[PDB]
Amino acid sequence: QMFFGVLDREELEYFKQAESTLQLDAFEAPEEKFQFVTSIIEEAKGKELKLVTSQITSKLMERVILECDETQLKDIFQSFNGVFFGLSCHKYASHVLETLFVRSAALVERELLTYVTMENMFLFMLNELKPHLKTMMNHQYASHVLRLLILILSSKTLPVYQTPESFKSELRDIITTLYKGFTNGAESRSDISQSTITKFREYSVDKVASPVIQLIIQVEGIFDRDRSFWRLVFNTADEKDPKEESFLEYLLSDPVGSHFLENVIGSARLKYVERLYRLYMKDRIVKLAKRDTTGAFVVRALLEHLKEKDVKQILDAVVPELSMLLNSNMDFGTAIINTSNKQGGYLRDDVIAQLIQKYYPEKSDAKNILESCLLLSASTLGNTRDDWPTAEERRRSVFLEQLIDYDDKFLNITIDSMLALPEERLIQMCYHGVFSHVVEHVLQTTRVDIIKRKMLLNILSKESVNLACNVYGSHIMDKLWEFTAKLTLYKERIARALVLETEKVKNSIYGRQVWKNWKLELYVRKMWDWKKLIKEQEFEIFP
């Protein structure tokens, strides 16, 4: 169902102009726009298949589908009856189907909370697709449509709607149909053979099919206690199998295979994950952890989804390697530290000793954790060009914030490192899209000694108004309302500075937030009550 004809000279002129008018959007009322869309639909009657399959017009068709009313949506839907599979396979029409299906899914939701219905129309195309599901899964365009349909039928996030119970049944029937196709009507297992299992493992790591397999393993548990597709990829018995082992060794040394395994571990039954770990990973965890681009993603997934005893076993093995892992794989290092924290600071002394040695050796005079961990001097901080903050900068910031949350030692080291900068450089951080958040992160009132608070405040308070009016700086000013607890003079100085620039501060959307959080309406209108809030805050923060 691939070719439906070419658009002639007149149709091309008309639909180009209509598309142009539609995007200029000069209509003065929604009613005018709807009427114009209707005029487009009227001209498209009998030509819809040509229009969705032509590169020139397929995007107009998506617009129309988005802009028309419910009744028109239904008519456009039925105009595709009998060719859904061919359209799903089409380079341009498949994207039209996706737009259609997503809007249709939203319509069955309100059709549920209140002629032939959208629900029944949707079921008709599902039944038309059922004999093609296997071909779709392997089709470079139709696999995306299949994947979207499974997302819709399982009520998951589309490019999240509630669904009829008929949808839950369709999910079951679609996945079961696919299941019978990838077996041979085996009817148990067994007799599923290798190479049928091997052929399915090949799809598992196939560029086209693999995202569909992942999603299926992810949702099949909604209606299948036995996890049939999970069992198709992996075994369930209590001992190793040679073929499963070689496949596992491939996944753990292959980028797609590792990300596949990483994703399905989060949705597998716990005992199935414990089994893969026990049989194929536990005795080689350190070796796997050192594979930055492959196996390490799997080790991280184990740390996030296994139970306490196994997680601590992995930590026993990987924590001694933490400094070395941090050399090339900071994201993994962050998750290891995070997991140690979640497991009650497990191996804390070893983690801390290593991080101190690597980022803040107490024998070094040049020591500064902003420099060793954020590479501050070589960063985009203070650049005169229009350089946004980079991905590496955000990564290093997230790592440092994790350290600050791990132990007061790193909070105190970070603050000392900020106080060690030239004052201008620390202020620059306050305006930086990523490093500002690091500044905000150290403003933890009950964890920072009052002398340290005074010293930070001596610096920040000079920039009170400009920080308050800034998109990043205003979060810092918000934190300073609590950070100045037990420091009334500092709180009074900042409040006074802001009120002196009342109009400039309230002209900023960020400033108005600070104004609210600093309760400055009270400061101005009912000073006695403001002063009372300050007294109460003190005992609320420091009881």
Author numbering: 50 to 163, 175 to 219, 251 to 634
Paste lines from the article.
Nop9, a nucleolar protein conserved in humans, plants and yeast, is essential for 18S rRNA maturation. Nop9 represents one of three distinct subfamilies of Pumilio/fem-3 mRNA-binding factor (PUF) proteins, along with the classical PUF and the Puf-A/Puf6 subfamilies. Consistent with a role in processing 20S pre-rRNA to mature 18S rRNA, we find that Nop9 binds to the fragment of internal transcribed spacer 1 (ITS1) present in the 20S pre-rRNA. Moreover, the presence of Nop9 reduces the cleavage efficiency of Nob1 in vitro. Together, our results suggest that Nop9's essential role in SSU ribosome biogenesis is to prevent premature cleavage of the 20S pre-rRNA by Nob1 in the nucleolus.
We determined a 2.1-Å-resolution crystal structure of yeast Nop9 that revealed a new PUM repeat fold with 11 PUM repeats (R1 to R11) arranged in a C-like shape. The repeats form a twisted, incomplete ring with an ∼80-Å outer diameter, an ∼35 Å inner diameter and 30–40 Å thickness. Most of the individual PUM repeats are similar to classical PUM repeats with three α helices, but with variability in the length of helices and interhelix loops. The repeats form a curved overall structure, and twisting relative to imaginary repeat-to-repeat axes is focused at repeats R4 and R7. Extended loops before and after repeat R4 and a long loop between repeats R7 and R8 each correspond to ∼25° twists. Repeat R11 diverges in structure from a classical PUM repeat with two α helices at the C-terminal end that cap the structure. Two long loops between helices α2 and α3 in repeats R2 (residues 164–174) and R3 (residues 220–250) are disordered in the crystal structure. The most-conserved residues across Nop9 family proteins are found on the inner concave surface at the positions that typically recognize RNA bases in classical PUF proteins. The most common motif in Nop9, SϕxxE/D (where ϕ is a stacking side chain and x is a hydrophobic side chain), specifies a G base in classical PUF proteins such as PUM1. This motif is found in repeats R1, R2, R5 and R8-R10 of Nop9.
